[PDB]
Design a protein around this ligand. Structure first.
Ligand SMILES: NC(=O)C1=CN([C@@H]2O[C@H](COP(=O)(O)OP(=O)(O)OC[C@H]3O[C@@H](n4cnc5c(N)ncnc54)[C@@H](OP(=O)(O)O)[C@@H]3O)[C@@H](O)[C@H]2O)C=CC1
Length: 186
């Protein structure tokens, strides 16, 4: 409910998006890691919470919205009411982060996950204080529209291991990938 955890899958060229969809064919095994990491709270009785941009929200297949068993917040400067299925709408990341720390949500919310928007990731990574980057390195180039911000290695430590994260190279449909975790304290 206070460290911010970004989670992203990125191609070798830092691509995250193409024509409102993913640059690569569906990687169902990588999506399982995304689901497990974002959904698993550390506390029974609390849910994790996901914050996303409006484009990312409408890019999720409808049959999969809201991201089930997570509290879903959508950021939009133009919507007046939350999208159908979304739990909260906020007009800024700052509004979202203030909401999450309200006492009425304390009993309710465990981990906070930033799940995209390029500009949502950008803003999250501008924040002072405790950040983690859960980065899936897709070890291939793909034609891309939208990109992940540079990861400053002076600022983010690459953790040698992280609980519940396997470090071996994975592969699906001939596409190799691996899970990394970065951390910026303070
Ligand atoms: N590989 C990966 O890990 C991921 C890939 N993607 C891909 O990325 C693409 C979508 O991402 P992207 O195009 O960057 O768009 P976003 O999901 O970041 O959505 C952009 C929109 O979200 C709102 N928004 C963003 N930031 C703020 C803010 N600070 N305050 C208020 N509103 C905000 C929109 O508002 P408005 O209604 O005001 O226009 C803005 O136009 C798709 O191709 C998707 O498939 C998405 C997530 C993860």
């Amino acid at each position: 409910v206070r460290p911010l955890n970004c989670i992203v899958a990125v191609s070798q060229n830092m691509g995250i998006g193409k024509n409102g969809d993913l640059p690569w064919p569906p990687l169902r095994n990588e999506f399982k890691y995304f689901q497990r990491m974002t959904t698993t709270s550390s506390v029974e009785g609390k849910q994790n919470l996901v914050i996303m941009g409006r484009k990312t929200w409408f890019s999720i297949p409808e049959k999969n919205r809201p991201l089930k068993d997570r509290i879903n917040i959508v950021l939009s400067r133009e919507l007046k009411e939350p999208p159908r299925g979304a739990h909260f709408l906020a007009k800024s990341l700052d509004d979202a982060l203030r909401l999450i720390e309200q006492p009425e949500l304390a009993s309710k919310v465990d981990m906070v996950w930033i799940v995209g928007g390029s500009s949502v990731y950008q803003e999250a990574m501008n924040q002072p204080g405790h950040l983690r980057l859960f980065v899936t390195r897709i070890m291939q180039e793909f034609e891309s529209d939208t990109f992940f911000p540079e990861i400053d290695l002076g600022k983010y430590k690459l953790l040698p291991e992280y609980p519940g994260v396997l470090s071996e190279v994975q592969e699906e449909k001939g596409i190799k990938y691996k899970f990394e975790v970065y951390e910026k304290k303070d």
